[PDB]
Amino acid sequence: KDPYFMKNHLGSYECKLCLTLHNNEGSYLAHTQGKKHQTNLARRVEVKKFVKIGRPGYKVTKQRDSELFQIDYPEIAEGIMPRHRFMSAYEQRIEPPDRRWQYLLMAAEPYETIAFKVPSREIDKAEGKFWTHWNRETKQFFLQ
């Protein structure tokens, strides 16, 4: 089983390793033994479906600060912190007209997402590890 001997379009034999031609069948079997042939041979989803959704009533309290909102959530009894994210108003269940603003929504696993619309372009940062906190002893969520 030599992977270098092939058949051309003229009824001949072609060795692609040394790039040689042979007319008859007896010249291809004798071209494997030699110096040039030996030299050429030597050179070469589960967490989303299991999430309970009862949608309780959230309690958010906003306050205009100057240099922040406080969301009161019940005991979740888990290590998963509620995450906040800023999205656009272009995607909706009914898609209302004149939707050209952004909304920061905070979501948890046993509770529903609470969203607040921001008419301004950029006045704060919606990052989770930068300016957010979640006290599990008092179960108080804050984001500034």
């Binding site: 967490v47 290590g79 909706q92 529903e112």
Partner: peptide, 17 residues
């Protein structure tokens, strides 16, 4: 675990109170 839980939550259930 927090990155897996944040990438699997529903971001279309918006509620403004």
């Amino acid at each position: 675990k927090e990155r897996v839980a944040y990438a699997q939550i529903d971001w279309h259930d918006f509620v403004v109170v």
